[PDB]
Every structure is written in structure tokens, then in C-alpha cells.
């Protein structure tokens, strides 16, 4: 069942968080924060800029110094702190899910049952790794004793998008903190509020000051200050391809800091004639429409074998026509608004390109309502590979359905993109499932499902959908720096 | 193609191998070695007993001493020696395959193309791990530096069966030597000859003396001397369930040495109605008949869904009726003899139990020829779970075919055995393949194939088919002894 | 600080725990449980025997069936249950530490601050591994897809000693449960009480019924029923060498179940002339006297370089003369009783052998008090390697101090034992610390400390001190069974 | 001993290597290649540019296609090919060492005994990993089967410097090929010759065409074509900080290809008063002077405790005054030339800055000879942290020696650099060795030695000395791309 907050949500935490204390901006400037379902201002937040990032980095650098509490405490106690933070987020789950929905335009049902549960589970997963991060002893040639330390990197700047503010906050700080790093987090200008509430819980849990610093503010200002900072050792980012390129360039020009990126995609589904048809239609539908299409792994190209193409298209339209748009906090509402004017304009412009370029509009195709950034759920059939809605990430509720008959050809078409975040394969054939998934150039391939993401699985893109992996055992590698120590000895023995 | 030796095979190495020198038995006694296809003596071999094992253990213990060449050389040089040994076996492949066939009653085609290639590949695989065996550095609670050494165990006694003399020799010494152990090997009394030739190549490759010692001789004498020896750290064994129990008991009574066992099985195949029928028939046929049925992973219970049962039975009989029995060295011969009188008697007695207990004899069912331990390839249909040929490992060319209709029931029937070495599943359904293989209590489960064994895969039994794993990354664990070293330090840092 | 229970301890849980319900013994028989400090009966407990073990195994087998709640729940939820159990033990820490002290004769200060903290930390460590136990995907030769499952083994019988009842209970059930096994636990007849209280918390935490079963009772009865049971897949044991041999023999005779043993030791310390002398004296003192000497890793042979031998002996005697014997619940008491009459008699008989065989009695040497199994802390100097107190594990407060001058010789003397659980090295020289620790045949080697044991470190013996490892990453291997699944595919790609 | 080539070296391979065939440049242009010891031209080589890189990438992309020989062959056969290549380089060791010395200005003794042995050993190490690169099976939440493939990335562009042409060629292609990638290699314009000879051996070994392509040519032309290429998946680079920044920027602007860099350093040694003084002087001397100082790990800041500073300085000068300069092919010659005019000018300009800024010139300080880019081995004492020779990587035979008395302060001074490739610690104190090495921000820390690099150890920089690691188990991660495959199943079991 779906419990709700029984009193009005009151916003309390609006300031910059550095050394576990609340700071005004150095400039004194604040910026507004809006509800995307009403277009109304929720509150003002301190606007961080380069001078505020500079204060946060100095705090994170001090907290990382040899001999500091965060460097010297047991790894198991790092894990304890993360498990306590997860307990506190669970305590404030109603508050946090409500704030996430109100600020992010996110269905409250999903915010409470999915985002908040993913936050809690991911933190608990990360807490468990803290004292299980291990180096090696190595049988080097010669009379030496050689071991490795998988040390924390140091100060990690982490730039977060607006589509999953809480989940992405925990995906970033969970592994970084578990490995022993300190962090300077820059939440999306649209959605700083839940991150600042989590900062209050980081204080309450007892993390040493400066281990986690949060600087709300804008991208070209605070974000660029992070990417180009001379004392940040690593930057992690999730968001647009364009900013990703900006970050890697600024990183190259400044101090060659380590960079990992996750940059969205144009993820394809291949539905073979032998697929469980109803299962494939349902998973591909949710794959493209989840969170109003504002998901990096959106299943935005669905290739269906000709023998079943028309049935797939009809059943997808039937399912797309069943949505209730409105305020994401009202029960029964099944689609909320897009985040803001920029994304809203982008979706409408791409929908129009689909009409003009000759796609078949099966349903939707325009805006909705008198307030809020709402877009009708839209289905396009007979899409071809050269159309804009086939090539560009839309980040809206816009589904593309294509036909194929040659399996060889559709794999090339699925791979013919600079993106490569995820893919789906729907078939009952063992051999096809293994060989197709091996052939797709995508970081996660789902077979007979879609959008299944768990803390135990590494997640990240092939090609221009990004570099590096998050979560799972493998993701923790990107938050460590390996040191080899080689000691001369009189005689070694195996 | 299949090259052959162009001169008569001459036997040269017949003595006990200790400290890289050839020893007569302490007793002076020798024992005969026979060709199972002719029942004629090939040569005499020095008979090792407890006093000879005692000399070999003293040599292996000396070679393992701290400061010795084998303990102090680079791990990478241990690997070099193993790769050189593989090169030398490849050089003597014609000789070794011929000797293996003549002594072991093994088809020369298989001996040359399969056993010898598996020997060479497994050695090269093991050589690659030598300098990649690594311990850990561990973020222990408190102000300590903790690391682990994955040391060699020490002197490993290794008792080998007669069905795959060379392959089992390399499966044992490859990992043991790669990890840095020293070994005392006791080949089967039936088949000492190829092991002694390999000992000549261990000398030629340059292994330090005492690293590999080979003591030919009998089970209750030399083998029991190994299992009960007070200075052997580990015993590894492949052979009968009965001896396996004898070894573990003697190990418990003496010095609590580590024991790993592989003890054969009664491995089942489940063939669902949707299986590729011809593929399933061919793999199950070879699965049961390979090397005259003298294989631990023999597919000796084949459960076939009723809808296709009669077709499966007919096609299996058709395939079983196509064999040519004779001397395993003559080209075109496709089935050789059983190893000796004991195995021959055991197979005939079990075949007769099948007739008496009411199985349907589809073909074969008796002995063959005027010399050699030959048994007609035999197929039984309508087998039921209480018959002796359903319960006891036969180790002969005797195939059992059963029907089922309830998938739930046939999994229980497949699991209703104290054995658990391997199983096969034949289906085109993705879900069935994953769920059935997860549900079978067997160490290796093949899907739409059978008998696929490679150096990269751990191999071993569930339940009374044995303990521990051989080969793959996981197998190397059983040839190391973990030491934790914990050092007090003034202050640790992550 | 050291909080205490503010009301009398009342014993509640005295029955057999099977399927999360409390059972009387099948026989109806109960046995008494005593306080070793007073020799007074505390309560009666249901006496489990073979028929009760048979009920527990049937319950554990049912809970392990494919499709059961414990097999199908998320690994992460297995970890959740373990973290909840740790929370509950932390809640009942005062109760549990008091009961442990009263039943086990264990100083309350240590019981509360060390045993209970080790229980809580080890459980939390084990909970973190549950969803991080992973198999492999393997690049096998040929056109196949090969992966491994690291499955739970199944029903694990776990026999626990009386010296660390709670800690050993958690060391056994923590890893077993984290890996997904079900367990049948047989606590020491002397000390069943804390295990039965933990069983009440296993119920409260919500573990599915039959996942943990606890059968109090005696060794030759309930314990032998476990070792010889035909449907227990693995037995783990900590206790005497003699029973260890009995278990491995019964395991070999019955169903070849997997066995791991930890069997105590005769652990040596080597103190070089350059050692921090006061540091070495203090660590070696606690190493031998901890928990009245009833510790497997007791530092029961201390070899000290001649130049500093007399100073080491004097300082050790000074420290040994500072103890206060009495009831382990009274504050300020620094040594409690031995567990029972058998251990008490054994210690006194070995002390007398030391006197007769010519050791120098520096202090102690006899019993103490009018009630309770108390032994004066005893120090022997000028011990030689042939004396009984040099060879046999004493398990009492009896310290042996020896001199050496040849480092080569003292390493041989340190290694000249069938035991091999642990060792200590005290030196300021880098090279000596690495080379000596590499040369000692012991499972844990401490450098400039002793007795440092943490959940992150594998723990176990070389030689006759046992087989296998507990805790750390490596310990989890012994609670999994590896299954290789190899799937035929049309074409593989790297 | 040191064998030599008995006939004149004849240069044969001067063309671009693509698809295992020799190509002229698309332009027709060639460039000269010089001997740095004589300043004389050795031969002309085809000059590759963007059009040639484009041909090589197309070939490498074709060789990486699903279904190709390199994608479908057994991993073990990838390893076979690498071991065969190592055999062939060993066969041509005299030829290759001579060519390396003549083209690279590298002492023949080192070229034959060190570079060529490192090439052979590193290849054999890499060959062993090929079929031991494994993914995971993961106990994900929900009813799913999840596994990972550690796939090759794809086409890897690899830009090589002139100081270790062969060793760096093998460090790049060894791991890349072992993991299954295809490569486009751009050797230094100064030193293309040995790489082209190795290309002839790649053909001879039987690597499929297009797996290894080598495009000799210049940095701003062929190198920039690689860094900015839209179909190269990863670029690896070793060389200057400045080019490293250029590569990462071009990578960010083009296709966000993965980048790893190794960029030299300013590596410090800390010599405590208790150090073995002669051992520290010898290791620090070779650490700074190896290969005429043209080593990334040059020990270019040596901090010595005041009590022993003057003795360290004298002994270092004594050792530096014992060199024989001349042609690196003549026996007895112990220092060769610098690579070219640019490096030569840079060294002399930095030597002069040392004089002007007030360092104490102990020996050397100017050029040498009438031909060749020779520099006298130069020692500076009383260096301070603000001088250019303290801050800038010199890449010449120029040693800096500094004093300290505060250990806290000297660690800060050691860390006060944007570099971070390596460091050395010289002390006999266990605690100091562990705590100092933990505190240094450097990728490899040697204790009581220096410059010990082996194929089993990961190697790479902290901070602006680069990102990622090469060699060892950890280095192989950077040549794989992780794919998560998650399959819906009816019910999972642990
Ligand atoms: N890490 C090392 O081992 C190493 C090696 C060589 C030089 N260095 C440092 O660099 C300094 C300058 O030496 P250098 O000029 O010969 O080094 P460099 O970085 O310019 O040359 C190294 C490699 O990079 C190539 N390259 C040059 N410009 C390029 C560009 N725009 N794009 C892509 N590739 C390009 C070169 O052709 C060569 O293959 C040296 O003095 C030394 O301090 C370090
Ligand atoms: C034997 C040897 N001794 C050395 C002593 C002092 C300094 C450097 C040394 C060295 O470098 C190498 C070497 O091949 N490198 C390439 C890889 C990066 C490191 C340099 C070998 C080698
Ligand atoms: Cl992985
Ligand atoms: Cl495995
Ligand atoms: Cl370990
Ligand atoms: Cl590592
Ligand atoms: Yb369906
Ligand atoms: Yb010296």
C-alpha cells in the first residue's frame, strides 16, 4: 500500500552545506525553485558559484588529509555510517518522497515505492562493501614483497541531473563514501531540495565534517567550477552529452582529473516473432514512458519483426491511451509534467519533426492542460532510421516503433548510433537471446524484460553514452586509486 | 588429420621417479602391465610400496623447504617450467598417444586428438596462473596492516585412476605445481607407463629435483601409504566411492591432511519435448558411450518426455548399432576394450541385472571377441528408478533410457541419487534451461550439449560424487593455504 | 564504560529450537547446566539426541528446498535478516553478556566489551557479503556460454565449543546464512544458554522456519548424530583434535559430507633482541592468559632471544602476579574459573608435569579458592621442547618461556609441532618481520602484536590445527558449492 | 653474459603496417630516422598521417566485427598467439636489442638484458591472462538471471614515446590483445624501427589481419588523428603532460573515447637516518640516472635526513663520477646520448637554471663530445623546493639532493607537486615504512629499493602523472568494457 504525509510539506533546508554547517552564498544571491506541475515557486535557495565550490573543496580536502577522522576510522565504521544514513532516509521516506514529487514533477507512487526504495537499498548495498574493498599481494619477479592498496582517490566532484535527484545523489555518494573519498555534490538547479534534506541527515548520522559538501547552483557557474578545479581529483557526471564533453574538456585543461560520465542514450529493443507478445509490449511501453520519458535508458527505438509488427503497434497504442495526467501528488494520476520549459520545448519540437518527416502519429502529439509542462503520451509508428525521433534522445513520453524482417540488418540498425547505454531483446529462443545480447553494443542488455536496475549490477554506457560503470562490484573500482608498494627483502618464498 | 607413430613403440621408463632419478623398488619387486585389448603383458614396472612412498615424501618435503629452489624461484618461472613441459608433451604427442592407447585400451583417435590435446591445453592454462595467484590486503578494524599470502600447501599426494591416465596426471600436477606445491603421484596399477614417460620430461624441462615424484604400484599398498602418511599435507583422488571413503578415513586417523575427491556419478539428462531431438540423441549417446563408458560424467540416466520417448529410443539404438570393435590402434575401430577383468565382470553382471529386473534390451547385452575385455554396446529402454542399472555406476557401454511426463517429478528423480557429478538439459526454452539447471544437484550442468570440459571451467561433484573443484580459477584455491599476517602500526589510513 | 544488567538474570529459553518452535526432547530427558564459578546448577535444558537431530535436519532440508522462501528471497534480504539479528543482539547485549559470563565463567568485562561486540560486528560483516557472493562468466574453449553459480551447499551441521559460545555461534551461522545455507547447530553441553536466547532472536528477526535449528545436548550423542548423518551436506567444528578426527572419520564413513575443522594449537612467539620489549611482554602475556588460557590461539610457547631473555621473564612474572581471581560478574575481578572439572584436572596435571620434568616455576602452580574451577596464573621458565607443557595444548593460565640464540634454529623449533593455528613475531627489523612470518607454518602470524582477530580476516589452521578458513572474503568459499553451467551456442564472440 | 649480433644490422621494415601488409604513405612522403649517438640518418620511413590512420582504423574496425576470426577464436588461442609472439621476439632478441640501441640511443647492455627481457616476460604474462578474463554472475534483486561480460572495448589507439620504444609497445599491445581488442599503434617519430620489426613478427605468428596496425609518423599529424578519430573507442598514451592534455581534450571534443595517460613525474625519495646508507645511495643513483635520466619514474628529488645528508651527497657524487660516455653499442660504455635536440636543449637549459638559482653543482653541468646529444652526468646539492630543477621533470642525467629534519615536513614536501608517478622510502623501521608509503601520493612506492617494475604489478600515476593502471591484474580492467545482461526468469533460487 501507499502511505502519505499527513501534514503539509514545509521546506527547511535551503542553504549551502559545507563542513556540516549551513552557509549563505558568498555572493548573497539566491535562486528560485519551482514546482513543474504548477509552474509556481516553492522557495529560494542559496546560489552557489565558484567561490562557494572553492570553500567546499577546501573542506573536502581537509577531511581527506592523512590522520583525519575519515581517513583513520575503520572501513567498517564508514559502512556503519552509510547504513545509519539509509536508516534515516527510511525514517524520512514520506517527507522525502513528497518533496521529490513536488520539486521534480515525479509521480508520488513511484517516488515513494521506487526512488526511495532504490535510495535505501543502494545505500545499504554500498555500506556492505566498505570493509570489503581489498588490494592484492603479488608474486612479483625478484626478491621483493609487493602489495597494493586500493586507496580512496580523494576529493570527488559529483554533478547530478534533475530526473532522479535522490537516486542519483545516492548512486554518487554511496560508492564514493564507501571507498573513503570526500565529495562536493552539485545537484541540478531545478531540484536541489531533497539533496539538502539528505545533507541534514548526513550531519545527524555523524559523518565527519567536510566528508559530504553540497553546493546548489547552476551548471555553467558551480558545475564548471567543479570540472575545472585544480584540487578536485575526480568528477562524476550524469546528464547531457553536450555538458559531458564540456566537463571532459575542462578536466583535460585544468588538472587531468579522472572523469566518469553517463550521458543518456537511444536504447533499442528487438522483438522477435517468437516473443511473448504481451510481455514485450508491456515492458517496452514502460521502458519508454517511465517518469514521463525522462530516463536515460528510455526504450526509444522498438524494432518489431514484421509478422507481429501490426499487432505490437495496436497493443502499444491501446496501452498508451490509458493514462491520467495531472498533479503527481494526487492518487490515481499516472503521468506528471516534464521538468521545465527547456525539456518541454525540446519534446514538442521533436514531436513536430516526427510529423513533418512522415512518421505515423498513432496517438497524442501535442501539449496538455493550462498549467504545468505536460505532454500527451505520443506513439509514432512506421519510423525510419533517418528521422530525428529515431536519432535524437527525446526525454519525453514519445514512443518509436519500427519494423524489420532481417535479423542481421536489425542488429546493425540497433547498433547504428553513437549512443550505447542499454538495449532489450525479446525472444523465447536460447541461442538468439545469448547471441543477440552479445552482439549489441550496449552497457546493459535486458532479455524478455526492460529497465531492471539493481544495486548489485554495474551500470553504464558503451560509446558516447558515457565511460565507466556505477554500482555493483565493478563500479567501486572507479572510486579507488591503486598504489603498488614493493619492498626489498633478503629472500622471498612462495 | 590423424598422424601415427612410424616405428614400433619401445617402452623405456619402468622405474620409480624420486629426486629426478630412477629408482628400483626397495623390495626389488616388480609388477606386470598388460594391454587390455590383447590380455598380453607389455612390460614389468618397479612396484612401489610404503618404503618407496616414504622416500618420495622425504624428497618432496625437502624440495618444499623454505629457501629451496622451488620455494624461492619466481612464480613466473614456475609457469615457464609448466609451459616447457607442455611443449615437451606436444613434442612426444605421437609416442604418448600410442602408449596411452596400448596401455589403457583407449581409441588412438581419441588419445591423440582429445586426451593429448587436453593435457597440453590444461598445462598451458595452469602455467598462466602461476604468477597470478594473489592474496589480499584487508581493511581490518584497528591500527593494523593486514595482508594474506596464498601459499602452497606443501607435499600433495595424488592418486590417479586408469581411465584417463595422462589427463588426470596433468589435472593433478598442473594446478599443484602452478601454486608451488610438491607432489607424490601414484598412478593406477593398470596404467603407470605414460606417467613415467612424463616424469622423464619433467626432468628434461628442468624442474628442481623432488618437485614431482612418481611411485607406481598398487592401491592398498602405495595408495594407502599416501592417505595415511604423517607428512603429506594434502591428498587428491579420483576413482571409486569406496576408496574415496577409505582415503578420507585414513586421512582423519593420521594427520588430518586436506582431502579432495572426485568419485564418479550417475549423471542424468532431461530431454524436454521441445528439444532439438537429433542434437539431444547425439550428445546423450556420446555422453554415455565415450571411452567405452569409462567416464565419470557418463550420461547413464536419460529421461525423455513421453511425446518424443519412442523416437528418442529408436534413434539412440540406430546410433549404438554402428560401432566397430577391435584393437584401439587400428584406424576405423570405434570401440576398444574395457580396462581389465574386474571392470569387465562388473559390467556384465550389471547388464544381467538389467535383463532380470525387467529392462527392455534394445541391442547388445553380452561380451565380444576371443581376446580382450570387450563388451557389446548395450541399450536398455523402459528402465525404472529402482533397477540396479538405474542406481549403480556401470562404467561400461550401457545406456539407460527412461520416460517422464511431469517435469516436477523428473527433476526429483534426477536428483534422487547420492551422486551429483554432472547433468544435461535439452530444451529450446530459455526459462526452462535456467530454472532446471539451477534445480539440478550436479557440479556441471550442460544445456543442449554434454561432456564439454575445458581447463577454464571448475569441475567437481555435489554430494557423494566428491568434494572440492579442479581447474578453472576456483580449482586453484584447493592447492593453496591462506596465511593472514597482521602488523601493528602507529596509525592506519584508508 | 561498562554498563550492567539492573535486574536479576532470568533464564527462559531451555528447549530445542526447530522450525522456529520450542520442542521438548523426543526422549523427555533434560540435562543440567552449571555455573563454573560456583559449581551450582543454573537450570535444566532439553537433551537432544539422534532423534532430535533427525527432526532438525528434516526441517533444515525442507527450508532449503528449491522454491522455498529461503531459496527464493533476494540475497539482499538474507543480508537484511542478518543485520536485523545483529540489531537484536545489540539490544539484548546486557542480557547476553551476563548470561555468557554466568554460564561460561567468562569475565563480564570481556563478555560485554569483546565477545558481544565481536558477535555484532561479525554478523554485520556477514550481512554485507550476502548479495556480493558472485560466480563467473568464463571464456571456455569452443562455441559455448559458460557461467558458474556459487550456490549454498545445503544443510550445514555446526558443532560449537564452550570457550566462546556466542562468538563461535555467530562465526558459524553468519557466513552459512549469508551464503544461503540452512544450519543445525549443536552448542557445547556446558554452554547452551546464550545460543538458545539467540534462537529466540532469530525467530523475532523473521528468518523463515527451519533456516536455523539449535539442538542442545552432548557430543557422543547429538554431535555424533550430526557427523554421521546421511542428509547433512557439511559439518563445521571447533574443539579438540580428538573429536575433529572422530568427525572426519564419521563423515568419511557416512555420506562424504564436506568437513572443516579448527582444532586449537600450540602457538609460538619469537621475540628478537631488537623488539620493543614492553610491547612484546604485554602482548605475549595477554596472548597466553586471555579467557583463563581457554583460547585456541593461546601464545603457549614464547621464544625470547638470550640477550633479553631474563628481562622478559621477570617482566612477564611481574605482570602475571597482578590478577584478582573470583566471580567473573564482580567488577574488578580479572580472572575467572576454568569451564569444568575435565579442563581443570587437565590443567593441574600438565602443571605438575612441568614441575616434574624440570621447568622453573616462577609463580602460581596450584588451584585456588574453595568453590569454582580456579587455577592460579602460572609461569614456567627454562622450558625445553620435549616437555609436556611445551608439546600439549594446556587450555589453562599457564605460560611457557624459552630462550634461543640461533634464529634459524628457533624457526625450526617454532615449526616443530603438528599444530599450526597462529604465531607471533616481535622485531623492529622490516626484513626479519617479512621473512620470519613467511617461514612460520601458521594460519595467522601477528607482527608486534598478538590475538588481533577481526571479521575481515580469514582465520584457520595449518597442519593439525584444522582445515579451511573462517571469515573474511576467503572464508565464504567454504559455505558455497560451485556449479558450472555450459550452454551450447551457434557462435561465441569475445 | 652479453651476446652480440655477429653481422651488420640491416634495416628492412620501413612501411606502414595495415591488415598484415606493408603500405606506402597515402601522401608518398617519407621521413628520416636518426641515430642519436652520431646524429646520422639511419633510413627513411613512410610518414603516416590522417589518411593512413583512417585506413588503419577501418582495418582494426573490420577485424573487431562480430563473427570475425579475432572475435570468435578461443581466448586461449589469443593467448597462444601472444606466447608465440614472445617466442619470436626472443628469437630476434639480438637483432631487436641492436636496433633499439642504435635508433634509441640506449645502452646495448640494458637493451639486451632489460628491455628485451621485459618485452618477453610482459608478453608471456599477458598471454596467460587471455582465457582468465572473466565476468560475474550476480544475485540481483527480483526474479532475474544477471551475468556480466567483460568484453573487449574495440579499436584502441595507442601512442608510444621514444624512451622505451619496445617495452612501451608491448605494455600497450600485450593487455589490449589479451583482452581481445584491436589496435592502431603510433610509435614515436624518433623510434619507429623496432615497432615495425615487431609488426613483421605479428604477421609471422599468425595474428588475423587488422588486429595490429602500426602507423609511423608525427604527433600533431598521425597522433592527433588518433585522439580525435570518431571510430576509435579508446586511446592510451605515454609521454608529456602537455600532449596528454591535448589528447584528453581532442577525445572530449570528438567521440568521448576512453583515455588513459601516463605522463612522467617528479618522483621523490625519502632517506631516513636509519637507512642502509650504501643501499639507499645506489638505488637513488640508478633511479635518477637510468637510461640517461629519460625515465618516467626518475628519482629526481632525493630528500635525505640531515644527520646523514653530507655523507649521502659525497657518496652519490663518487658514484656519478664513474661513467664512460660514448656509443651505446660499444662494450664498457655506461652512458649514451639523449634522444634528440629538443630533449638535449631542455636538459641544458634546466641545468643552467639550477646554477643561476643557487644550487650547488657537485659535478658535471655541461655537454660532452663532438657528436651526439651527450650530457655530462650532473649532481646538484642544496636544492630547494622552489627551484626549476626541483619542480620540472628534466628527463636528463641530473640528480637533485635535498636535506630535511622534520619527517612531517618532508612528506608534505614530497607530496607538494602536481606529479605523482612513484616514490621511494629508505628506512629500517617497520612502522615508518608502512606509514610513509601510505602517506605518499604516488602510484608505486618502493621501500629500500627503486625502479622495480614487473609485469605482475599495476603501474600508473596519481594526480597529473596520469590516470588508469597498466599491467598486473588491475591493468586489464582498462582494456575491457563491462556489459550487464539481465534475463527475466519465472523464479530464481540462490
Ligand atoms: N611518461 C614518459 O615516459 C615520457 C616519455 C617521453 C617524454 N616525456 C616528457 O615529455 C617531454 C617532451 O618530450 P616529447 O616532446 O618527445 O614528448 P611527446 O609527448 O610530445 O611525444 C610522445 C608521443 O606523443 C606524440 N605526440 C606528439 N604530439 C602529439 C599530439 N598533438 N597529439 C597526439 N600525439 C602527439 C608523439 O609523436 C610521440 O609519439 C619530455 O622531456 C618528458 O619530460 C615523458
Ligand atoms: C631494470 C630497471 N632498473 C631501473 C632502475 C632505476 C630506474 C628504472 C629502472 C628500470 O626501468 C625499467 C623500465 O623498463 N621502465 C619502463 C616502464 C616504466 C619504468 C621504466 C627497467 C628498469
Ligand atoms: Cl562485473
Ligand atoms: Cl567460479
Ligand atoms: Cl585472502
Ligand atoms: Cl591490485
Ligand atoms: Yb504473456
Ligand atoms: Yb648496505
Residue numbers in the entry:
A (entry chain A), B (entry chain A), C (entry chain A), D (entry chain A): 8 to 501
What text comes from the article?
To study the functional role of ALDH1A1 in OCSC, we identified a specific small-molecule inhibitor, compound 974 (hereafter referred to as 974). This inhibitor acts as a unique tool to selectively block ALDH1A1 activity over other ALDH isoforms. We demonstrated that 974 inhibited stemness phenotypes in ovarian cancer cell lines expressing ALDH1A1, and an in vivo limiting dilution analysis demonstrated an essential role for ALDH1A1 in CSC survival.
Ovarian cancer cells with increased ALDH1A1 expression have a higher self-renewal ability, and HGSOC patients with tumors expressing high ALDH1A1 have poor overall survival. Although ALDH1A1 is a well-accepted marker for OCSC, the exact mechanism by which ALDH1A1 regulates stemness remains incompletely understood. In this study, we demonstrate that aldehyde dehydrogenase 1A1 (ALDH1A1) is essential for the survival of OCSCs.
